[PDB]
Amino acid sequence: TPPVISLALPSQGLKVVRNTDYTFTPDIQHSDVEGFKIEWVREGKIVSTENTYTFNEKELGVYTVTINASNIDGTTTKDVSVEVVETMPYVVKFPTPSYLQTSTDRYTFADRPVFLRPLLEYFDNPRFEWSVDGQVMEGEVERMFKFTPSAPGEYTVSCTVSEDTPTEKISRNIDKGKTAVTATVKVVCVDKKEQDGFRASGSSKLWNKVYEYTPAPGQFINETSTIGGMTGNETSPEAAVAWATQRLKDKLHVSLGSFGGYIIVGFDHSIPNSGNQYDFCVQGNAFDGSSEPGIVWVMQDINGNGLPDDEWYELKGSEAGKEETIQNFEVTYYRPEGKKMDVQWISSDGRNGWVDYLSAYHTQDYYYPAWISENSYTLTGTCLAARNTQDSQTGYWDNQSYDWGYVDNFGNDQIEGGSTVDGSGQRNGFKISNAIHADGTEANLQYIDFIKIQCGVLAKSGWLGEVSTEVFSFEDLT
Ligand code: CNC
Ligand SMILES: [Ca+2]
Ligand SMILES: [Ca+2]
Ligand code: NA
């Protein structure tokens, strides 16, 4: 009397969700017999010898799972067809260096940590497991994993993000359980030493190239008056780069729009981490009451290809580490369904709001950038706590200052020269020594090759419109 396997399926077949645990608990008649063994076989190999087995697959398709049970009276076998047919919006992905870049590969020098951190969608209560080259890293259970290669080569890092989602009975023998989504990212430890990537020489102290101009929505985006300077031709990322390039050459404003908007520039040489007061400066238009702080991020061309596709490092400012500052904030903007409308956003803290359309001042059809093809996009960055406030007596708005560390901000790190009346010629100076790793520790960069300015507040001030960093120039001061 060998064993027989009972495993009830839905009458319509077993149609399951991707990235979701299904536990199979078959009834084994004559499990009492001496010499009882059970095996679970998938694509030839034995995946389990327990009485239950849990399935979870990422790819849609039909998977065959074979059960084999034995005792001293004979053997038996059963085949269950598991059809992965439904998706759910749970996503784990590693970030690229900018909106328009698609590679997730990461680059570092030997003995320099890389702080790996996935972006998540739909997760509310995530748990983390990390692996390097197939080996689970015991004790690494946090949203970031600090990985430090000690030798050149390529390393495959895997992160499984799980969430305790509600259990469901699928049949007498099948239970739907937790969600678990896996993503992988390649870390390249380059063969070079950091010092050997210093680009000496150089012909200009100014920025030499704009690589990308991806603002957030704002009243100066697609603004075609003489005040805005756009032409209507900025309908592609290449045209946006050409426009920003000419504006910066002429030291005319480039607005980043609302939170997260950014521009990426480089130089024809590396800017050293120097003993001067400042290593570089950025021209804003701040005056007292008109602070629209931009977060400064810097990048070394670790992989040597001339492109800003390596690691960004934040320059800490006066608000770094305060519990009210939000690292790794995300804002998603939506192109409105018609012309002359407010631009809606939702943020990663669960808030929602909009950038106001101001028909009195900026009369273009859209404040969402014309050259962002997609009808929604998500920008990340450090978000400072907003301090724009309206005086009720006068009704006037005060976009209040931060102490130091930010672009277009009337703080303590300004370089003499700008008008305190209208902000023309205003500059802030910056120190590469303020560069930090993602956990707040010192990055100790010897030099930088690229700068990204990221609008650092999500706010608006009535008839002033959104709080939006403007930049006008970039200069190596060493
Ligand atoms: C257009 C403009 C400007 N304005 Co008004 C005028 N006229 N502003 C306005 C309009 C902005 C509309 C919009 N775009 O959403 C408008 C009508 C709302 C306005 C209002 C005011 N402005 C006023 C003043 C005096 C000035 N503003 C000027 C900035 C003066 C500018 C003079 C100039 N630069 O030529 C100006 C001509 C050009 C600004 C600009 O487009 N910059 C380009 C943009 C890309 O940069 P930005 O950093 O984002 O500019 C922002 C700030 O300028 C802010 N803002 C504008 N005005 C002020 C004034 C103050 C005190 C503060 C703190 C912020 C502002 O709004 C702009 C858009 O967000 C000013 C330098 C002109 C001057 N007299 O020399 C002067 C401020 C001097 C100072 N205190 O340091 C008012 C007090 C006038 C009034 N009502 O009595 C009032 C105060 C606003 C407030 N704080 O609540
Ligand atoms: Ca590069
Ligand atoms: Ca602005
Ligand atoms: Na400004």
Numbering used by the authors: 115 to 592
Question: Which sentences from the paper describe this structure?
Answer:
Human gut commensal Bacteroidetes rely on multiple transport systems to acquire vitamin B12 and related cobamides for fitness in the gut. Here, we report the function and structural characterization of one of these proteins, BtuH, which binds vitamin B12 directly via a C-terminal globular domain that has no known structural homologs. This protein is required for efficient B12 transport and competitive fitness in the gut, demonstrating that members of the heterogeneous suite of accessory proteins encoded in Bacteroides cobamide transport system loci can play key roles in vitamin acquisition. Our data indicate that BtuH2 is a membrane-associated lipoprotein that binds vitamin B12 directly, suggesting a role for BtuH2 in cobamide capture at the cell surface.
